[PDB]
Coordinates of C-alpha atoms and ligand atoms in Angstrom, one line a residue:
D1 CA 99.9 242.4 140.9
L2 CA 98.0 240.7 138.0
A3 CA 100.8 238.3 137.1
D4 CA 100.7 236.7 140.6
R5 CA 97.2 235.6 140.0
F6 CA 98.1 234.1 136.6
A7 CA 101.2 232.3 138.1
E8 CA 98.9 231.1 140.8
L9 CA 96.6 229.5 138.2
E10 CA 99.6 227.9 136.4
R11 CA 100.7 226.4 139.7
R12 CA 97.1 225.2 140.5
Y13 CA 96.5 223.5 137.2
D14 CA 100.2 222.6 136.6
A15 CA 99.9 224.5 133.4
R16 CA 101.5 227.1 131.3
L17 CA 99.1 230.0 130.6
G18 CA 99.1 232.7 127.9
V19 CA 96.9 235.9 128.1
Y20 CA 96.6 239.0 125.9
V21 CA 94.1 241.7 125.8
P22 CA 95.3 244.5 123.5
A23 CA 95.1 248.2 124.8
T24 CA 92.2 250.5 124.2
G25 CA 91.4 254.2 125.0
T26 CA 91.6 253.9 128.7
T27 CA 92.9 250.4 129.2
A28 CA 96.5 249.2 128.8
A29 CA 97.5 245.9 127.2
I30 CA 96.9 242.9 129.6
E31 CA 99.8 240.6 128.8
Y32 CA 101.1 237.3 130.4
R33 CA 103.4 235.1 128.3
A34 CA 101.7 237.0 125.6
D35 CA 104.8 236.5 123.4
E36 CA 105.5 232.8 123.9
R37 CA 104.4 230.3 121.3
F38 CA 101.4 228.0 121.9
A39 CA 99.8 225.7 119.4
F40 CA 96.9 227.1 117.3
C41 CA 94.8 224.1 117.6
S42 CA 91.2 224.8 116.3
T43 CA 91.5 228.5 116.8
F44 CA 92.9 229.0 113.3
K45 CA 89.5 228.1 112.0
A46 CA 88.2 231.6 112.7
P47 CA 90.7 233.5 110.6
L48 CA 90.4 230.6 108.1
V49 CA 86.8 231.4 107.6
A50 CA 87.7 235.1 107.2
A51 CA 90.3 234.0 104.6
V52 CA 87.7 232.3 102.6
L53 CA 85.1 235.0 103.1
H54 CA 87.7 237.6 101.9
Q55 CA 88.8 235.6 98.9
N56 CA 85.4 235.2 97.3
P57 CA 82.1 236.9 96.5
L58 CA 79.4 236.1 99.1
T59 CA 77.4 234.0 96.6
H60 CA 80.4 231.6 96.7
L61 CA 78.9 230.5 100.1
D62 CA 76.4 228.6 98.0
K63 CA 78.9 226.5 96.1
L64 CA 78.4 222.8 96.9
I65 CA 81.4 220.8 98.0
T66 CA 81.6 217.0 97.9
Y67 CA 83.8 214.8 100.1
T68 CA 84.0 211.1 100.8
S69 CA 84.9 208.6 103.5
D70 CA 88.6 209.2 103.5
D71 CA 88.1 213.0 103.9
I72 CA 86.9 212.4 107.6
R73 CA 90.0 212.1 109.8
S74 CA 89.2 214.2 112.9
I75 CA 86.3 215.1 115.1
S76 CA 83.6 216.3 112.6
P77 CA 80.1 216.4 114.2
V78 CA 78.5 218.1 111.2
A79 CA 80.5 216.6 108.3
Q80 CA 79.4 213.2 109.4
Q81 CA 75.7 213.9 108.9
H82 CA 76.1 215.5 105.5
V83 CA 78.7 213.4 103.7
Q84 CA 75.9 212.0 101.5
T85 CA 74.3 215.3 100.3
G86 CA 77.6 217.3 100.4
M87 CA 78.1 220.7 102.1
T88 CA 78.1 224.3 101.0
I89 CA 81.1 226.6 101.7
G90 CA 78.7 228.5 104.0
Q91 CA 77.7 225.3 105.8
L92 CA 81.4 224.3 106.1
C93 CA 82.1 227.8 107.5
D94 CA 79.2 227.5 109.9
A95 CA 80.6 224.1 111.0
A96 CA 84.2 225.2 111.2
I97 CA 83.4 228.0 113.7
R98 CA 80.4 226.8 115.7
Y99 CA 81.3 223.1 116.1
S100 CA 85.0 223.2 115.4
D101 CA 84.4 220.6 112.6
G102 CA 87.8 219.3 111.5
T103 CA 86.8 218.1 108.1
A104 CA 85.0 221.3 107.4
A105 CA 88.3 223.1 108.2
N106 CA 90.3 220.8 105.9
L107 CA 87.8 221.3 103.0
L108 CA 87.8 225.2 103.6
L109 CA 91.7 225.1 103.5
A110 CA 91.4 223.1 100.2
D111 CA 89.1 225.8 99.0
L112 CA 91.7 228.4 99.5
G113 CA 94.0 226.1 97.4
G114 CA 97.7 226.3 96.8
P115 CA 100.6 224.3 98.3
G116 CA 100.2 222.4 101.6
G117 CA 96.5 221.8 101.1
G118 CA 96.0 225.6 101.5
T119 CA 98.1 226.3 104.6
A120 CA 100.4 228.5 102.6
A121 CA 97.5 230.6 101.2
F122 CA 96.3 230.7 104.8
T123 CA 99.6 231.9 106.3
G124 CA 99.6 234.3 103.4
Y125 CA 96.2 235.6 104.7
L126 CA 97.8 236.2 108.1
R127 CA 100.8 238.0 106.7
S128 CA 98.5 240.3 104.8
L129 CA 96.9 241.5 108.2
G130 CA 100.4 242.1 109.6
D131 CA 100.9 238.8 111.4
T132 CA 104.5 237.8 110.9
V133 CA 104.3 235.6 114.1
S134 CA 101.8 232.8 113.4
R135 CA 102.6 229.8 111.2
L136 CA 100.3 227.0 109.9
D137 CA 101.9 223.8 108.5
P138 CA 105.2 218.7 120.4
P139 CA 105.1 221.5 123.1
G140 CA 107.3 224.4 122.0
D141 CA 107.6 223.1 118.4
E142 CA 107.5 226.0 115.9
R143 CA 104.8 224.4 113.7
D144 CA 101.2 225.5 113.9
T145 CA 101.8 228.0 116.7
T146 CA 101.0 231.6 117.3
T147 CA 101.2 233.8 120.4
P148 CA 98.4 235.1 122.5
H149 CA 99.6 238.5 121.3
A150 CA 99.6 237.8 117.5
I151 CA 96.2 236.0 117.5
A152 CA 94.5 238.7 119.5
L153 CA 95.6 241.4 117.1
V154 CA 94.4 239.2 114.2
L155 CA 90.9 238.8 115.7
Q156 CA 90.8 242.5 116.6
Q157 CA 91.3 243.3 112.9
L158 CA 88.7 240.7 111.7
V159 CA 85.9 241.6 114.1
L160 CA 86.5 245.3 115.0
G161 CA 88.4 246.4 111.9
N162 CA 88.5 246.9 108.1
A163 CA 90.0 243.5 107.1
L164 CA 86.6 242.4 105.9
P165 CA 83.8 244.5 104.4
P166 CA 80.8 245.0 106.7
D167 CA 78.6 242.2 105.2
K168 CA 81.4 239.5 105.4
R169 CA 82.6 240.9 108.8
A170 CA 79.1 240.4 110.0
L171 CA 79.0 236.7 108.9
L172 CA 82.2 235.9 110.7
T173 CA 81.0 237.7 113.8
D174 CA 77.6 235.9 113.8
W175 CA 79.1 232.5 113.5
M176 CA 81.3 233.1 116.5
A177 CA 78.4 234.6 118.5
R178 CA 76.6 231.3 118.1
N179 CA 79.6 229.1 118.9
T180 CA 78.5 225.8 120.6
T181 CA 81.9 225.0 122.2
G182 CA 83.1 227.8 124.4
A183 CA 80.5 227.7 127.1
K184 CA 83.0 226.9 129.8
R185 CA 86.0 229.1 129.0
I186 CA 86.1 232.9 128.4
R187 CA 82.2 232.9 128.4
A188 CA 82.2 231.6 132.0
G189 CA 84.5 234.3 133.4
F190 CA 82.5 237.3 132.2
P191 CA 79.2 238.6 133.6
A192 CA 76.0 237.6 131.7
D193 CA 75.4 241.1 130.5
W194 CA 78.7 241.2 128.7
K195 CA 78.2 239.8 125.2
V196 CA 81.0 237.3 124.2
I197 CA 81.9 235.8 120.9
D198 CA 84.6 233.2 120.6
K199 CA 86.4 230.3 118.9
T200 CA 88.0 227.5 120.9
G201 CA 90.8 225.0 120.4
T202 CA 91.8 221.9 122.3
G203 CA 94.6 219.4 121.7
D204 CA 97.1 217.0 123.3
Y205 CA 99.6 217.9 126.1
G206 CA 96.6 219.4 127.8
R207 CA 96.2 222.2 125.3
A208 CA 93.2 224.5 125.6
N209 CA 92.7 227.9 124.0
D210 CA 89.9 230.4 123.6
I211 CA 90.0 233.6 121.6
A212 CA 87.2 236.1 121.9
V213 CA 85.8 239.5 121.4
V214 CA 83.8 240.9 124.3
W215 CA 81.5 243.9 124.6
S216 CA 80.8 245.7 127.9
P217 CA 77.2 246.3 128.7
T218 CA 77.5 249.8 127.2
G219 CA 79.1 248.4 124.0
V220 CA 82.9 248.9 124.6
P221 CA 84.8 246.0 122.9
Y222 CA 88.0 244.1 123.9
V223 CA 89.8 241.1 122.3
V224 CA 90.7 238.4 124.8
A225 CA 93.2 235.7 123.9
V226 CA 93.8 232.8 126.3
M227 CA 96.1 229.9 125.5
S228 CA 97.4 227.2 127.7
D229 CA 99.0 223.8 127.8
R230 CA 100.2 221.3 130.4
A231 CA 103.3 219.5 129.1
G232 CA 103.9 218.5 132.7
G233 CA 101.3 215.8 132.2
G234 CA 102.7 214.4 128.9
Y235 CA 100.9 213.6 125.6
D236 CA 97.7 212.6 127.3
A237 CA 97.4 215.3 129.8
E238 CA 93.8 216.7 130.2
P239 CA 92.8 220.1 129.1
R240 CA 91.6 222.3 132.0
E241 CA 88.8 224.6 130.9
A242 CA 88.6 225.9 134.4
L243 CA 92.0 227.6 134.0
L244 CA 90.6 229.4 131.0
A245 CA 87.4 230.5 132.9
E246 CA 89.5 231.6 135.8
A247 CA 91.9 233.6 133.8
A248 CA 88.9 235.3 132.0
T249 CA 87.4 236.1 135.5
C250 CA 90.7 237.7 136.4
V251 CA 90.5 239.7 133.1
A252 CA 86.8 240.4 133.5
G253 CA 87.8 242.0 136.8
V254 CA 90.3 244.5 135.4
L255 CA 87.9 245.6 132.6
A256 CA 84.7 246.0 134.7
Ligands
LIG1 C1 90.5 221.6 117.1 O1 91.2 221.8 118.4 C2 89.7 220.2 117.5 N1 90.6 219.3 118.4 C3 90.9 218.1 118.1 O2 90.4 217.5 117.1 C4 91.8 217.4 119.1 C5 93.1 217.1 118.6 O3 93.5 217.5 117.3 C6 94.6 217.0 116.7 C7 94.3 216.3 115.3 C8 94.0 216.5 119.5 C9 93.6 216.2 120.8 C10 92.3 216.4 121.2 C11 92.0 216.1 122.5 C12 90.7 216.3 123.0 C13 89.7 216.9 122.1 C14 90.1 217.3 120.8 C15 91.4 217.0 120.4 C16 88.3 220.4 117.9 N2 88.2 221.8 118.6 C17 88.0 221.6 120.0 C18 87.7 222.9 120.6 O4 87.8 223.1 121.9 O5 87.3 223.8 119.8 C19 87.0 220.5 120.3 C20 85.5 220.9 119.9 C21 87.0 219.9 121.7 S1 87.6 219.2 119.1

């Protein structure tokens, strides 16, 4: 049984784990806590970049955005070394996905505009793709959570579907392919000849997420959503990337 392995991982890492791989032609859904809520964390940044991409002509990626000292409130490795010059929407997009740049995310939200610095327009974007589950706005807390199941179906639609026109779908896909942050999660649990694109998230209460699209060596695709937290260790509990790698390995197994 596959759920025994997963429960084993949860015991080992003293974690709660969430896994969802949506069904295909010959494969059934892989699901484990696939319907419980977990924080979004940085993972929202991927569909956030789709939101922006969808919303505008491609040449909008060339609009220059200025931001100051007070705009830099979270880990922002790219927004630090630009604050002077400014940054383009495309550069912010690049930074949001590939480096999980928090300031880049907050500026891209602000670009979407509307109430709540853009989080309503954002949620609106998710409703439009049939996601009634997620919500952007404390383990368990309703706010800024999604389910392994809801996010995986969102990513499926963005990377393998008609949510974005080929050209814009491509741009999203490329940024995730060249992610710098996911080396030790889903990537690590799949053989080197499977091609894996992903966006990660990480937070307090030992939260660690990875959402990905994978392609078998013969080009068959799957969406893989892995979400976890470790409330057992309190606010300052450490994220366990291993747990994510391991789960992926167990998922790599079934799909190989
Ligand atoms: C999005 O998850 C980012 N995470 C954090 O900035 C973050 C955090 O955010 C609340 C404002 C709270 C606690 C921690 C603890 C340790 C690292 C980061 C945070 C960025 N994304 C992460 C990712 O895995 O994609 C990251 C690159 C480690 S920071």
